[PDB]
Amino acid sequence: ANQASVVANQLIPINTALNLVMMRSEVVTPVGIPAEDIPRLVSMQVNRAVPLGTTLMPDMVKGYAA
């Protein structure tokens, strides 16, 4: 209950480096990467294009290990 995840604030293009305009948090189901990891996700790249409103999942960010 109430775990907030990272949600795509806009379409995050393939292989693009993440920035703070790109990520917002929301309570979504299923639970994805925790909202508190938005600082650490900055500059990491996605390996697939992430459509607007998609929850960001661990398998989508290159070099992500929590």
Swiss-Prot record:
This is Type-3 ice-structuring protein HPLC 12. Residues 5-64 form the AFP-like domain. InterPro entries: AFP_Neu5c_C, AFP_Neu5c_C_sf, Antifreeze_III. Its main location: secreted. The keyword tRNA-binding does not apply. It comes from Zoarces americanus. It is found in: Secreted. One of its GO terms (cellular component) is extracellular region. Detected in blood serum (at protein level). Belongs to the type-III AFP family. It comes from the Eukaryota. The record marks 10, 15, 19, 45 as: Important for ice-binding. Contributes to protect fish blood from freezing at subzero sea water temperatures. Lowers the blood freezing point. Binds to nascent ice crystals and prevents further growth. Keywords: Antifreeze protein, Secreted. The lineage of its organism: Eukaryota, Metazoa, Chordata, Craniata, Vertebrata.
